[PDB]
Design a protein around this ligand. Structure first.
Ligand SMILES: Nc1ncnc2c1ncn2[C@@H]1O[C@H](COP(=O)(O)OP(=O)(O)OP(=O)(O)OP(=O)(O)O)[C@@H](O)[C@H]1O
Ligand SMILES: Nc1ncnc2c1ncn2[C@@H]1O[C@H](COP(=O)(O)OP(=O)(O)OP(=O)(O)OP(=O)(O)O)[C@@H](O)[C@H]1O
Ligand SMILES: [Cs+]
Ligand SMILES: [Cs+]
Lengths: 328, 328
């Protein structure tokens, strides 16, 4: 079949944003495609991470990946750093990418605020993501909207290398969902829901408890009209909450706009909290099962084994094309 | 004993400049220290290289490394790309280095002329060189003068990581020779002798033949005084040629200034050509022996094996300190 690749950084617990925009579709896709799902830890470190917490977020993400229904026998789930080829590839691509191309990446100008001194791994994030993808001769990359641009740079780098050193890489394509590709922060509806938001009220994580979900939802930035209708420019808050409600419940923005008429925010929120609560209930229960057993580690071992064979073969080929090392 | 590390890029055939400033001292040091000598191929690719030529320069450098007297049983000689840990380390260090620190590297502002678009591997060269070094718990780095700054950045990165994530790395020290640390181009005595000089007349390679050496020496940029005396600012050409003559022959600048009095350039050069010719004669003969046998490959296999055990153990430790992957 066709091959898909997608990664999720172990920089916090994944949010209902990471779930709706990417992970949720992983559970279906793993049956239609040859899928590689990665815990991108080498990306996580482009920005400070407490060591103990990175270790634990890596193992939690793995458990959630499984908990939401990824089948270790249908998809290969693995940790990037456990596969050296990602760093080997990343360096070879860093050599054909242009500083100007890196400097212009949106995620880099954003993440690099006027902030005094930035780590180069923030500039060089993109070639590593290109490796992640190109290593597996990837066809489709199922990601939320924010990663689109990085994927285009991935494509340019594949084509650059192919015409510079001969056909080797497959030219991947992004696959952003038509709905819920950019879930916004509950605290500022102009910013995306980001799991590394300094303000925990910005996101709801897949591991948040009922009480906590009820508060973040309650606290969510709405407006004054007490009118439950969809408007992205007028009521960016209420719009966002509508989507989450839609995508998560099954109902359209309309059947929800209807259901909440002469009805106000207070109730609309307490219901959204229960929708999100119920959605995460089965997930969280399976999550606990995976966290208390050595089974998760076995999964990951076999996942790296499999990624190592495919990717290490691609590095050999790339080396052969560029003339690195010796004839093997 | 103490550990030394030094690398030589496979970007051309090494010059009498690379020989006088670094390689020559390798032959003695390998007995006093625990030495790792590397064919830095991943560095070579920060700038375009024809694949076939890179492959062949990698194997030639290996042969010269041996030919000049490096003893595979006293020093570990190996190819960087054959050891994944160099790229793994390089990425972890790219994450603690600062763009501003890279941007200010001398070799990067030079190599990055006003040139329209530069490859990021030219900005990121330094973290890879830091890995090369730090991976082996390196004490001394025997290099020519130009690499000094890169070594200081290496030191800052070691100290940065040690205080950020705990003591792990040894703080290396440079070891530049007092004599012949900056052999200059035969064609422009303001520029260093660089083996990737577009103008072949700029350098004499360890593989140049008698005829060729005789021309490059003859062509060498002198002056008008026809006076064989040492002056770095006045006669930068003649000064340089004096050094090469000194360091290579054994005689001081003085015994040479003396020997050439009422004597002119024409003869002083034809003699220098024979000094350089005779110096390279044994080297070149041993070089041919190493190029026509599978013995060179065995050397390199055992060299990578040995580098892989030491470096892979260091990556494990660095990962453990930063919290990457899982507990191993
Ligand atoms: N708000 C979002 N809505 C829908 N999809 C999203 C949203 N944010 C990210 N994704 C998609 O989730 C996947 C995992 O992303 P990632 O690997 O964590 O990288 P990111 O940088 O874009 O993620 P976060 O913002 O949540 O985390 P941090 O960077 O703060 O650590 C991707 O496929 C992504 O597009
Ligand atoms: N002109 C020189 N005189 C004395 N020593 C020199 C001179 N140039 C370099 N070295 C020392 O040689 C070693 C090998 O250097 P390298 O690994 O090739 O890197 P480089 O970039 O400084 O070397 P070249 O200039 O000759 O090659 P290219 O970059 O053009 O490919 C180092 O220990 C170095 O200092
Ligand atoms: Cs499948
Ligand atoms: Cs030794």
């Amino acid at each position: 079949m066709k091959t898909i690749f997608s990664g999720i950084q172990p920089s916090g617990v994944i949010t209902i944003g990471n779930y709706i925009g990417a992970l949720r579709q992983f559970v279906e896709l793993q049956h239609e495609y040859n899928c590689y799902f990665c815990i991108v830890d080498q990306h996580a470190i482009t920005v400070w991470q407490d060591p103990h917490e990175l270790r634990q977020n890596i193992r939690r993400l793995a458990a959630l990946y499984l908990a939401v229904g990824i089948d270790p026998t249908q998809a290969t789930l693995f940790i990037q750093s456990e596969v050296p080829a990602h760093a080997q590839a990343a360096w070879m691509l860093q050599c054909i990418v242009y500083i100007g191309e890196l400097e212009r990446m949106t995620q880099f100008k954003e993440k690099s605020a006027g902030k005094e001194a930035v780590s180069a791994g923030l500039l060089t994030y993109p070639p590593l993501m290109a490796a992640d993808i190109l290593l597996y001769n990837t066809d489709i990359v199922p990601v939320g909207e924010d990663q689109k641009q990085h994927i285009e740079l991935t494509r340019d780098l594949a084509e650059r290398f192919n015409k510079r050193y001969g056909e080797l890489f497959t030219i991947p394509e992004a696959r952003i969902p038509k709905v819920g590709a950019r879930i916004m922060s509950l605290v500022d509806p102009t910013k995306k829901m980001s799991k590394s938001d300094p303000n925990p009220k910005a996101y709801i994580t897949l591991l948040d408890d009922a009480k906590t979900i009820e508060k973040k939802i309650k606290s969510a930035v709405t407006d004054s009209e007490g009118t439950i209708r969809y408007d992205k420019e007028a009521k960016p808050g209420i719009s966002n909450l509508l989507n989450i409600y839609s995508t998560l419940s099954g109902q359209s923005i309309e059947e929800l706009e209807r259901q909440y008429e002469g009805k106000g925010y207070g109730v609309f929120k307490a219901d959204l909290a229960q929708v999100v609560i119920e959605t995460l209930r089965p997930i969280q229960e399976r999550y606990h099962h995976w966290m208390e057993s050595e089974e998760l580690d076995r999964v990951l071992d076999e996942g790296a084994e499999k990624a190592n064979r495919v990717a290490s073969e691609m590095v050999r080929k790339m080396e052969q094309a560029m003339g690195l090392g010796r004839r093997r």
